[model samples]
Target: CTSCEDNAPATSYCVECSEPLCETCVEAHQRVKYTKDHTVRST
Candidate 1:
């Protein structure tokens, strides 16, 4: 995923950040208020 150093496969897309996220990153992203409300779609 774009958010992680490993570049893992993307499982979701974040509208605000305009980046793809892996499962692990998705969990972390949702934990933060700034990004928790961001629209996310399955990739």
Candidate 2:
């Protein structure tokens, strides 16, 4: 539940961006326009 490149820790990995993300980051991506299309999944 903790492993992101930004040093914020993560709950999952971002397949498209190839980065790790926490719950908030995932939600943020969904809110964005271009990045909304990126796929996110649990680890």
Candidate 3:
């Protein structure tokens, strides 16, 4: 029941301008060349 806010559905990116992603934002961010080795999780 941990639903996100109304804006979450419209959040189609990492909110950091890292990429043009939606649900995959976090995963993509973690996979960045500079952060590929870093661990990432859902917000």
lDDT of each candidate versus the true structure: 0.88, 0.79, 0.43
- The candidate that achieves the highest TM-score relative to the unseen native structure: 1
Candidate 2 clashing pairs, residues 3+ apart or interchain:
3-10
For model 1, residues 1-43, the per-residue Cα lDDT tens digits are: 8788976899899888899999899998889988888888899
lDDT score at residue 15, model 3, on the 0-100 scale: 33
Error in Å for residue 25 of model 1:
0.7
TM-score of each: 0.84, 0.74, 0.29
**Candidates' RMSD to native:** 1.0, 3.6, 8.4
**Candidate 2 TM-score, true structure as reference:** 0.74
**Model 2 bad stretches (over 4 Å):** 1-8
lDDT of 2 by residue, 1-43 (tens): 2443566668788898888788888988889898998889887
Q: Please give the range of 10 consecutive residues that has the lowest summed lDDT in model 3.
A: 1-10
State the lDDT of candidate 3 residue by residue for 1-43, as single tens digits. 1123333342343434433334544455566687555443343
Clashes of 2: 1
* Per-residue error (Å), model 2, residue 31: 0.4
Worst 10 residues of 1 by lDDT: 1-10
